[PDB]
């Protein structure tokens, strides 16, 4: 009975829909967070965050410079696509 | 009838408050945007970085335009005695009054009170003067402001120079478009 | 309690509520700073930035 | 009538958000897929591995196509003043507008908003222009994008080169098809 009412074609459909509807919820979270970010831009200036990260990195002895905008198989496969 | 001096005075002060606030907010958002350009340049996606800096140039021009309108609203407040006293438009105010009427339809999405300022100035100096302003047939609207609120795309050399400066500041390797740098 | 004494009572209360809100923010700046250090030591740079 | 500028502006921003997300997801799924090719090659099932890499090549081309459309949507947003101002289509936008109308029927399974972007651009520049776009009779749709969304099978030499690189990376012995490597 249950394999009739929910056959594999119907499961296939349901799983596709499930996945596609969580893609949409990701798109919606992203733009809620982008709104909130722009909404409170003056409460978090970029340079102040960068300086706090650099200060905490200096204390930790970490060499990574925090102001800057801080796999090869993918690169080679890309070069192949360009070569053909 | 139509014109009410206190509607104009209150809304001119409101326009200054709102512009003063938008300039700060937009300036901060430009910082966050420039960091994003560096990330695109680091990822070697220069052709997109070019289109993203067009947004930055337009917001930067807009902030400069808001500073000009803030100044003209403050000028009409400083010389509000003349506005309220005469029925003719003074020469000293012509630039300010015409520019504010010209700008309102462009800006009233962001600065809602600017519509009311324009509507009151048209009620004062008549609808016909208001129409001659909106097209700049009156030949008195401030040229730099009209440039800064133009819908035209930035010059290619300005885009390249923006990328050069941003790349230099964030220590990202960038090579500018040779054709554009030659055309300049 | 007079109608103006009510308004004064509410203004005094709002002033304290804002003052408490400032104290809560300060104590949470200290709490978040501690979490940055922990995240840096564990190499979790994305969490450090949050 | 039909055309609404804010429907177009909102949906262009939505299209960028969705593409930006699909590129990340598809890139990650390509990693998991390449591991599976190595498992087939290790099991000596090379003749199947060839058919499985055709899926990888097509997803990789699709991700590259999504990056091109993301750029054209961002361009129409950057120059949205012109779209809204003129009634004629500018030269600078012709590539972007025609390509987005051409791509929508191919992509609208994945990117649902892209249909609305296309429908609005057809409402703006007329249904006839929309039909000339969908066939590329208008001769303006971006060639690289049309290649990347073609339904043709990958070249045999591309398939072999993919297997060579994947095999090398996962340290799996592979011997390529001598006939294909000779034909190249």
Swiss-Prot record, chains B, D:
UniProt keywords, alphabetically: Cell cycle, Cell division, Cytoplasm, Cytoplasmic vesicle, Cytoskeleton, Nucleus, Phosphoprotein
Localization annotation: Cytoplasmic vesicle; Cytoplasm, Cytoskeleton, Microtubule organizing center, Centrosome; Midbody; Nucleus envelope
Modification Phosphotyrosine occurs at: 40
Sites of Phosphoserine modification: 1
Organism: Homo sapiens (Human)
Gene symbol of the encoding locus: IST1
Region Interaction with CHMP1A and CHMP1B: start-end pairs: 1-165
Function: ESCRT-III-like protein involved in cytokinesis, nuclear envelope reassembly and endosomal tubulation. Is required for efficient abscission during cytokinesis. Involved in recruiting VPS4A and/or VPS4B to the midbody of dividing cells. During late anaphase, involved in nuclear envelope reassembly and mitotic spindle disassembly together with the ESCRT-III complex: IST1 acts by mediating the recruitment of SPAST to the nuclear membrane, leading to microtubule severing. Recruited to the reforming nuclear envelope (NE) during anaphase by LEMD2.
Keyword match Cell cycle: yes
Family under the similarity heading: Belongs to the IST1 family.
Parent-protein start and end of this portion: 4 to 187 of 364
Biological processes, Gene Ontology terms: cell division; collateral sprouting; cytoskeleton-dependent cytokinesis; ESCRT III complex disassembly; establishment of protein localization; midbody abscission; multivesicular body assembly; positive regulation of collateral sprouting
Protein name as annotated: IST1 homolog
Gene Ontology MF terms in the entry: cadherin binding; identical protein binding; MIT domain binding; protein domain specific binding; protein-containing complex binding
Swiss-Prot record, chain C:
Subcellular location(s) of the protein: Cytoplasm, Cytosol; Endosome; Late endosome membrane
Regions annotated as coiled coil: 26-48
Tissues where this protein is expressed: Widely expressed. Expressed in pancreas, kidney, skeletal muscle, liver, lung, placenta and brain.
Domain of life: Eukaryota
Assembly information from the UniProt record: Probable peripherally associated component of the endosomal sorting required for transport complex III (ESCRT-III). ESCRT-III components are thought to multimerize to form a flat lattice on the perimeter membrane of the endosome. Several assembly forms of ESCRT-III may exist that interact and act sequentially. Interacts with CHMP1A. Interacts with VTA1; the interaction probably involves the open conformation of CHMP1B. Interacts with CHMP2A. Interacts with VPS4A; the interaction is direct. Interacts with VPS4B; the interaction is direct.
Family indicated by similarity: Belongs to the SNF7 family.
The protein's role, per its UniProt record: Probable peripherally associated component of the endosomal sorting required for transport complex III (ESCRT-III) which is involved in multivesicular bodies (MVBs) formation and sorting of endosomal cargo proteins into MVBs. MVBs contain intraluminal vesicles (ILVs) that are generated by invagination and scission from the limiting membrane of the endosome and mostly are delivered to lysosomes enabling degradation of membrane proteins, such as stimulated growth factor receptors, lysosomal enzymes and lipids.
Protein name as annotated: Charged multivesicular body protein 1b
Organism encoding this protein: Homo sapiens
Gene that specifies this protein: CHMP1B
């Amino acid at each position: 009975a249950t394999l009739k009412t929910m056959n594999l074609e119907k499961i296939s459909a349901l799983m596709d829909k499930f996945e596609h509807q969580f893609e949409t919820l990701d798109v919606q979270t992203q733009q809620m967070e982008d709104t909130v970010s722009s909404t409170t831009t003056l409460t978090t200036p970029q340079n102040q965050v960068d300086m706090l990260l650099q200060e905490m990195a200096d204390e930790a002895g970490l060499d990574l410079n925090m102001e800057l905008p801080q796999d090869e198989l993918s690169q080679r496969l890309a070069r192949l696509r360009d070569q053909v | 009838s139509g014109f009410k001096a206190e509607r104009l005075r209150v809304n001119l002060r409101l326009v200054i408050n709102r512009l003063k606030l938008l300039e700060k907010k937009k300036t901060e958002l430009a910082q966050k945007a420039r960091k994003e350009i560096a990330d695109y340049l680091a990822a070697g996606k220069d052709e997109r970085a070019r289109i993203r800096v067009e947004h930055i140039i337009r917001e930067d021009y807009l902030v400069e335009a808001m500073e000009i309108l803030e100044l003209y609203c403050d000028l009409l407040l400083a010389r509000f005695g003349l506005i309220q006293s005469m029925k003719e438009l003074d020469s000293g105010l012509a630039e300010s009054v015409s520019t504010l009427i010209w700008a309102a339809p462009r800006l009233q999405s962001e600065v809602a009170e600017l519509k009311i300022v324009a509507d009151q100035l048209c009620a004062k100096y008549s609808k016909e003067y208001g129409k001659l302003c909106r097209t700049n047939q009156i030949g008195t609207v401030n040229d730099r402001l009209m440039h800064k609120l133009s819908v035209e795309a930035p010059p290619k050399i300005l885009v390249e120079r923006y990328l050069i400066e941003i790349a230099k500041n964030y220590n990202v390797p960038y090579e500018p478009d040779s054709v554009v740098m030659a055309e300049a | 309690m007079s109608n103006m004494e009510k308004h004064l009572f509410n203004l005094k209360f709002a002033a304290k509520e804002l003052s408490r809100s400032a104290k809560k923010c300060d104590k949470e700046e200290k709490a978040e700073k501690a979490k940055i250090k922990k995240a840096i030591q564990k190499g979790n740079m994305e969490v450090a930035r949050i």
